[PDB]
Design an enzyme around this catalytic site. Sequence first.
Site, PDB file in Angstrom:
ATOM      1  N   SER E 140     168.019 -32.388 -18.733  1.00  0.00           N
ATOM      2  CA  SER E 140     166.729 -33.625 -18.759  1.00  0.00           C
ATOM      3  C   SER E 140     165.348 -33.384 -18.448  1.00  0.00           C
ATOM      4  CB  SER E 140     167.658 -34.531 -17.312  1.00  0.00           C
ATOM      5  OG  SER E 140     167.150 -34.596 -16.798  1.00  0.00           O
ATOM      6  N   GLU E 254     172.715 -27.766 -42.986  1.00  0.00           N
ATOM      7  CA  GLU E 254     172.260 -28.760 -43.492  1.00  0.00           C
ATOM      8  C   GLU E 254     172.104 -30.351 -42.663  1.00  0.00           C
ATOM      9  OE1 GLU E 254     175.601 -30.685 -45.981  1.00  0.00           O
ATOM     10  OE2 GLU E 254     175.088 -28.533 -46.869  1.00  0.00           O
TER      11      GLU E 254
HETATM   12  N1  LIG Z   1     171.934 -40.143 -18.291  1.00  0.00           N
HETATM   13  C1  LIG Z   1     171.483 -39.478 -17.178  1.00  0.00           C
HETATM   14  N2  LIG Z   1     170.801 -38.620 -17.308  1.00  0.00           N
HETATM   15  C2  LIG Z   1     170.838 -38.758 -16.046  1.00  0.00           C
HETATM   16  C3  LIG Z   1     171.803 -39.032 -15.182  1.00  0.00           C
HETATM   17  N3  LIG Z   1     171.706 -37.952 -13.669  1.00  0.00           N
HETATM   18  C4  LIG Z   1     170.487 -37.496 -13.452  1.00  0.00           C
HETATM   19  N4  LIG Z   1     169.338 -37.725 -15.004  1.00  0.00           N
HETATM   20  C5  LIG Z   1     168.067 -38.069 -15.600  1.00  0.00           C
HETATM   21  O1  LIG Z   1     167.901 -36.952 -14.434  1.00  0.00           O
HETATM   22  C6  LIG Z   1     166.215 -36.890 -14.112  1.00  0.00           C
HETATM   23  C7  LIG Z   1     166.321 -36.285 -12.680  1.00  0.00           C
HETATM   24  O2  LIG Z   1     166.658 -35.078 -12.864  1.00  0.00           O
HETATM   25  P1  LIG Z   1     168.547 -34.634 -12.118  1.00  0.00           P
HETATM   26  O3  LIG Z   1     169.055 -35.011 -13.223  1.00  0.00           O
HETATM   27  O4  LIG Z   1     168.278 -35.411 -10.735  1.00  0.00           O
HETATM   28  O5  LIG Z   1     168.640 -33.352 -12.590  1.00  0.00           O
HETATM   29  P2  LIG Z   1     167.147 -31.760 -12.813  1.00  0.00           P
HETATM   30  O6  LIG Z   1     166.726 -32.534 -13.942  1.00  0.00           O
HETATM   31  O7  LIG Z   1     168.212 -30.787 -13.452  1.00  0.00           O
HETATM   32  O8  LIG Z   1     166.807 -31.323 -11.730  1.00  0.00           O
HETATM   33  P3  LIG Z   1     167.178 -31.786  -9.693  1.00  0.00           P
HETATM   34  O9  LIG Z   1     168.115 -32.703  -9.377  1.00  0.00           O
HETATM   35  O10 LIG Z   1     166.671 -30.401  -8.940  1.00  0.00           O
HETATM   36  O11 LIG Z   1     168.484 -30.379 -10.919  1.00  0.00           O
HETATM   37  C8  LIG Z   1     166.162 -38.605 -13.549  1.00  0.00           C
HETATM   38  O12 LIG Z   1     165.373 -39.181 -14.434  1.00  0.00           O
HETATM   39  C9  LIG Z   1     167.380 -39.156 -14.530  1.00  0.00           C
HETATM   40  O13 LIG Z   1     166.469 -39.621 -15.830  1.00  0.00           O
HETATM   41  C10 LIG Z   1     172.853 -38.778 -15.510  1.00  0.00           C
HETATM   42  O14 LIG Z   1     173.978 -39.151 -14.796  1.00  0.00           O
HETATM   43  N5  LIG Z   1     173.238 -39.456 -16.172  1.00  0.00           N
END
Ligand SMILES: Nc1nc2c(ncn2[C@@H]2O[C@H](COP(=O)(O)OP(=O)(O)OP(=O)(O)O)[C@@H](O)[C@H]2O)c(=O)[nH]1
Lengths: 186, 95, 244, 430, 439
Positions: E140, E254
Site C-alpha cells: 500500500s 507475455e
Molecule cells: N485495500 C485495503 N487497503 C487498506 C487496508 N487497510 C489499510 N489500507 C490502506 O493502507 C493505508 C495506510 O497504511 P496501512 O494500511 O495502515 O499500513 P502501512 O501503509 O503498511 O503503514 P504502517 O501501518 O505504518 O505499517 C490506507 O490509506 C489504506 O488505503 C485494507 O484492509 N484493505
Amino acid sequence: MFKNTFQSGFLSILYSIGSKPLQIWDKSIRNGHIKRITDQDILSSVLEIMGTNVSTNYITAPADPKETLGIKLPFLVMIIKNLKKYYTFEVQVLDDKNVRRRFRASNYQSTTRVKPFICTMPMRLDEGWNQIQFNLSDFTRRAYATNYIETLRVQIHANCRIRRIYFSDRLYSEEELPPEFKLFLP
Amino acid sequence: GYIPGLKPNNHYGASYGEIAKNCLSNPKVAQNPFKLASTGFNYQRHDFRDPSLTATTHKFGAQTLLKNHPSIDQKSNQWQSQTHDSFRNPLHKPN
Amino acid sequence: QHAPVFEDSQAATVVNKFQGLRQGTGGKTSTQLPVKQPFQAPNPICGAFKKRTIPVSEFRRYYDRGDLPIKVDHQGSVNKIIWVIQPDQLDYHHYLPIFFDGLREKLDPYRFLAILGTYDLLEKGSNKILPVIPQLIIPVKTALNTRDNEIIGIMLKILQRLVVSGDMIGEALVPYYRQILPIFNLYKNCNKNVGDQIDYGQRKKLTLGDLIQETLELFEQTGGEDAFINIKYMIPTYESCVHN
Amino acid sequence: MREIVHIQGGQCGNQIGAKFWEVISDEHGIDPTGTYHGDSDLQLERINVYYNEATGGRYVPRAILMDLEPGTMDSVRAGPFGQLFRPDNFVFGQTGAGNNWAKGHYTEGAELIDSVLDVVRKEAEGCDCLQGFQITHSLGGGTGSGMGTLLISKVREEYPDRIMETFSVVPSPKVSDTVVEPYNATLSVHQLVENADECMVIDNEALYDICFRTLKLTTPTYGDLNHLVSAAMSGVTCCLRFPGQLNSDLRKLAVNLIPFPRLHFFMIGFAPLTSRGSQQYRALTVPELTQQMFDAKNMMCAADPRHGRYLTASALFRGRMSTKEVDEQMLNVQNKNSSYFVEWIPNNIKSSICDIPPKGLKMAVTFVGNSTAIQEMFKRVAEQFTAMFRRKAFLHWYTGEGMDEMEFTEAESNMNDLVSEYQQYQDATA
Amino acid sequence: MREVISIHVGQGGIQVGNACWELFCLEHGIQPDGQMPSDKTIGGGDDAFNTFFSETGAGKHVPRAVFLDLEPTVIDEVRTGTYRQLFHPEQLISGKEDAANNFARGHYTIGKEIVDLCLDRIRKLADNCTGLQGFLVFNSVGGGTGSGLGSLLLERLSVDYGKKSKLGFTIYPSPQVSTAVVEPYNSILSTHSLLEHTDVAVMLDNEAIYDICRRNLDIERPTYTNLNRLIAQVISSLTASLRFDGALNVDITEFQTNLVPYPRIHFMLSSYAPIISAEKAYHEQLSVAEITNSAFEPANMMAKCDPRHGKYMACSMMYRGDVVPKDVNASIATIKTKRTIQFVDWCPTGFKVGINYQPPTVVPGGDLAKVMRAVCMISNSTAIAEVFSRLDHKFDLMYAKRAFVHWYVGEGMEEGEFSEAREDLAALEKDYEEVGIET
Ligand SMILES: Nc1nc2c(ncn2[C@@H]2O[C@H](COP(=O)(O)OP(=O)(O)OP(=O)(O)O)[C@@H](O)[C@H]2O)c(=O)[nH]1
Ligand SMILES: Nc1nc2c(ncn2[C@@H]2O[C@H](COP(=O)(O)OP(=O)(O)O)[C@@H](O)[C@H]2O)c(=O)[nH]1
Ligand SMILES: [Mg+2]
C-alpha cells in the site's frame, strides 16, 4: 515561429535590455514572483525569478502550445547568475528519425540515466558571473546515436538571473564576440 | 421496511440477504420477561425496575453502565470472518 | 462632517404595488417554494497584519530632561549630528540600550535623532560592542513586534549594520535566533508580481519581501558552523546558503 | 515490546492517575491483589506494555509516584486498588514546595530529583524496546509545575529518540484555585514546549460545564472530573494493546498531527457520554458518535473550537464498525465546515480503528485535535500575568531563592511569541 | 517447472496477502493445516499445487511467501489464528518499532536493520524452485513501511536477480477519501522508486471499490475484509493460465510483451465482472457478449478514473469459464463498434485474448455467488494521467510552506530528495500527452 528565417551567426531568443524584454515568451506563476532589477555584480539591468516549489514556476519559449520553435543553430549557451539554490533548465530536440527528445538538467541531482524520452545530467555552477556552453550536438549523439536537426523548445525555471540567451553556431572565444554578446567584467 | 437488526445495533460487513436472514431468524424480538399486556393494563403489576444502580456521594459519582454493552465475546475482527469450513455451505439446499 | 439627506433617498426601478397583509404560504405546499437560508457564521480572519500600537519608548524621557548628549547640527545640507564628547570614552554598556529603544520613535526630531545616533556607535566602536550584545535583544524584539512597514524596514537596515560591524559578533546572535527570527516568518513572500514592468524600488528599498532575504543570508555566513542548524527551526522556507 | 512507563507528580498528578490505573486495571481484568481473573485470550496478549512480571504471579504498574510532600503519596496507597504501586517506587521530600515554583525547580526539587531520576533509569533500562513516557502534572501547582517540568528537562538529555506525552491542566479564567496561578503557569510553558514531544491542554472550566450540559448529574465530585480525563487516557493507546484493522501507535499520531516543530499542543474529548437515566433510548450508530465528537461543548478545553480553524485532527474510532462508513463520515465533516479548516492542507482528517471495546459500551470515539483556538488560553493567561508583573506583586518569594527579576521577562517574550506565531499560520493562504 | 514467489510487505500487503491465500488454499484442496485429506479429493491434473506450493515429501505443503512488517501486532495475529500451521515459522520476519509513516524511516534508518535478513530468506527460496517466472509484490503506497520497504527491497531485487519479471499490486490514495494525513508525501516518493524497478503495476484505489461494492452487491456496510476478497478474485484471474488446462493460454512473460508500449508508461488499471450476490446471481443468462459489456462500463473500473477522458492503448482482457472462442469473436467486434470507446491511432487492434476453463471458486462466508463465466481485464488507458495529475497538485500545496517536512529531514535524507520526485512525476505528465497526440 522563426521558421524560414535567417540563422547564420547569432540568434537572440531572449534578452533583458529593451522596452519589451519578453514578448515571444509566456509566463505562468503560481507561488513565485517575476521582476527585473540591477545587480551588484554587473552594472546593468537583469531579469530575475525567485520562489519555492521549483517545479511549479517556469517560463516557456513558445507563446502557446501546439506550435514549434524549430531552429538549426548547432549550439546553445546562456548567461545566468549563480543563486546557490535549486536550479534547472531543459530543452527539447528532434532527431533524424521522427522522435521527440527532451533533456532536463538539475543542479540537485547526482545520478544520471538515459531513457527513451528523458536524459538527466548534473551540473556545477560557480560563484561570480559564469557562462555555460551546452554542446547540444555531442550530447544528442552520445545518448541515442541519432543526429539533431533542430531544437524544439527552451525552458527556464525559477531561482536564477539571466542576462542573455543565444545560440553559438560554432565555438566562439572572447575575442570573436561582438561587444554586445560579451559579458564585460565589472 | 424496518429490518429490526440493521439500524438499532450496527452490524459488521456482510451481504444484505445474509444479514437480514440472521436477524429475523434469531431469538428475542418477542417474549415478555415481565408479562405486560398489549392493552396496557398489566401496567400496575410490573414495577418498571432497572437493576443498574447502587448509590454514590463522597467518593466517585459516575456509576457503572447498564447492560447495553458486550462482554466475554470480545474477539478481533479477523476471528469471525476467516475460517476454513465451519460455516454453512453456500450451495447445500438438501433435496 | 457631512451626511446625505437619508430620508429623501429614493428608488426607481422597484414597483410601487403593495402586497398587504393578505399573503399566505398555506394551501400551495409545492416542491419549489423559496426556502430561507439559515443564518451562517462568517469566516474568521483574526489579526494577521493589524496594527500593534507600539508602547511608550524610553528615548524621549532621556532627551526631554537632557541626559543623552546629542545635538542636531545644521551646517551640512542634511542634519548631521555632532558629539558633545569624542564617542570613544562613552560607556557603551549604558547608553546603547537607550538608542535602539528609539527605533520606535517616528515623530521628529527624535525619530531622526533615533536612528542616526545608533549608526555612529557601531562605526567607530570596535571591541566594546560584544559585551553589549546580550542586552541589545529586548529593544529590538518588540520593534519587530510593531508590524509597521516604516518601522520594520529601518531595523533590517539596522541589523545588517549590527552584525558585520565587529569580528565574532555574528555568532553570538545564533543562540538569540529564537527571538529575533519569529517576525521574519510572516513577510518572507510578500512581494509584488509586477512582471515584465520595471520596479523602481531600487533607490528606496521599501519592498519588504526582498529586504528580508539579504538580512537572513548575512547571518549564516557570519554565524559560523552552527549558523544553519538553528535557522531551520524558525523559518522553514530557508535554503542552505554556505553549503553548495 | 514498545512498552511505556508512567511518572506522575503533584497532588493533582497523584490523584488523577489513581483513577487512571483503576480504569486500566479492569479493562485487562487484573484484580487489585494481582491474580489473573480475566475472561478472554486477548486480555493478556499485550499485558507487557503497562504491566511487569514477578515471581508470585501478580502484576505491577510501571509508575513512580513522585511528589514533594508526604500527605499525597501516603494517601493514594489507602485508596481502592492502592496496593499495586511498588513501595520502592515512592520518592518524596520532607519540606514541601509551598506552591513556590522556585521551591520545586531550583531549591527543593533539585536536591531530591537526583534519586528520582535513578528510579527512572532502572525502570527504563529493563524494558525490551522503550517507546516513550506519559507525564501527568498540573501547571498550576508549584511543586507540580516546577519539579514536574524540571524532571523532563534532563530526561530529554538521555533518550532523544523516545516520545514524551504530557497531560497538563491549565488554570481557566472562570474558576481559579490559587492566587499565584499565573506566575507558575507562565514559567512552565517556556520549558515544556521546547522539551515535550506532545502536551495536551485540559481545562477545569470545561469539565464542570460538561458535567451539567451532557451528564446532567446533580452533584459532580472530584471523582467525576477524574473519570472523564482517565477515559481519554485509554484512547491514545487503545489500539496499541489489541489487534485491529489499522494499528495506530503514539509515534504515528505524532507524525501526523504536528505540522511544524514548534506546535505540539492538542485538545481532546470523549464520546459517547449520555445521562445515566436516558441511556437506554439513544442509538449508538457511527454518525451519532462523530457529531458528538466535533461539538463545542464536548471539547475537553475551555477554548471554543469554532473561534478558530482546525489545522488537523485525529480520531481513534474503537470497536466493531465497517471502515467505509467510518471514512465517509470523516469526508462529510470536511466540506460542511470547509472554511473552518485551513485550506493549504487538503484532506485534513485522520482516522483509526481498534476492535476491543471497554467494559460498558459497544462503540466509542477518542478525539485528539489540533485547533487554532488555543490562542485564547495563552492570551488570557498572558494578559493576567502581564498585569501582576508591572507592580511586583508576589514577586519577592521567587527572587529570594536564587532567581533574578530578569528571568521572568525572558518567559514573557516566549509565551507571547508562541501566541503570535501560532496564529501566523491561522491566516496564511495559498 | 514453473513457479512464482509471493512477497507481502506492510499491513496493507499482509491483510490483502492473507486474503489471497484462502482463495489460493481452497482452489487446490488444501485445508488450513496444510495436509491434503486422504478422502474427498477434487484435484484436476497434477503439479497444480506446484505453481505456488512446494512439497514437503509426504502430507502437507507450504506457501511461497515472505511477510515483512515492523509492527508486531499485524504479524502476531496470523501466528495465533487458524492458519498457524500453514506458514514456515522463520519467514515471518518482523521488527519491534513501527515505521510511523516516515517514508525515510523504513528506507534509510530503521529499514536497513531488516533488509539484509529479508534478502537472505529470498536466496533460500530462489534455489528451491527451478525456473522462476517472476515475483508478485503487494504493498500500500499510502504508508511509509509499504512505500519505504517496497523501494528498498525492489532495488536490491533488480540487482540481485536481474531480468526476471516482477509485478506490483499497489493501492494508491483516493481523490477525496483518505485515512491518513501524510499520504500525498509518500505517494510521490514511492512512484519515483517503483517507476524504474518494476515491470507491471496495477491500480487498486480504495474509493473506487466502495462504489464497486455498492452498485452490485447491495451492501451499505462494507469493511476491509470484504474489500480484500474482491482483489483475491482478480489475483486468481491473472494466473489462471499457469496451473490449469486451456485452449489459448498466456504466460506471465507475455505481459511485458503486450501491455507496455514504452518502458515508462506501465501503469494499468483493472476491472472485474460479474460480481452478483447469491440473492440475484440466478435470474440472468450471463452471456459472454453481455458480460464483457460490464467489463468496459465506466463505473466498474478498478480505480476512480473515468476512461472516457482519454485513449485505450491495449487491453489484455482474460477469460475463465465456459467460453467458446467463436463467442469471443462476436464480443471483441461489438466493442469496437461503440463510439464511447476510442482507441489510439497507432494501435489498430489492442486486444490480447486469453481463455481458461477452471471456473471461479466460492470462498465460504463471503459475498460472491457462483457464476459460470468471468472476465478480468488489465487495461492500459491514457486516462491514468489524471491520477498522477491530482497527486502532484496536492504535493504543491503542502510544500509551499513545507509543512510536515521537518519530520523527514531528521531521518538522514538530504533536503533535495523531496524536489527530485517532482521531476519524475512531472516529467511523466508530459509523456502521456505525447503518446496520445495524433500524427
Ligand atoms: N485495500 C485495503 N487497503 C487498506 C487496508 N487497510 C489499510 N489500507 C490502506 O493502507 C493505508 C495506510 O497504511 P496501512 O494500511 O495502515 O499500513 P502501512 O501503509 O503498511 O503503514 P504502517 O501501518 O505504518 O505499517 C490506507 O490509506 C489504506 O488505503 C485494507 O484492509 N484493505
Ligand atoms: N482532576 C482533578 N483535579 C484536581 C482535584 N483536586 C485538585 N485538582 C486540581 O489541582 C490544582 C491544584 O494543584 P496543587 O494542589 O496546587 O498542586 P501541588 O502544588 O503540586 O500540590 C487545582 O487547579 C485543581 O484544578 C481532583 O480531585 N481532580
Ligand atoms: Mg505500521
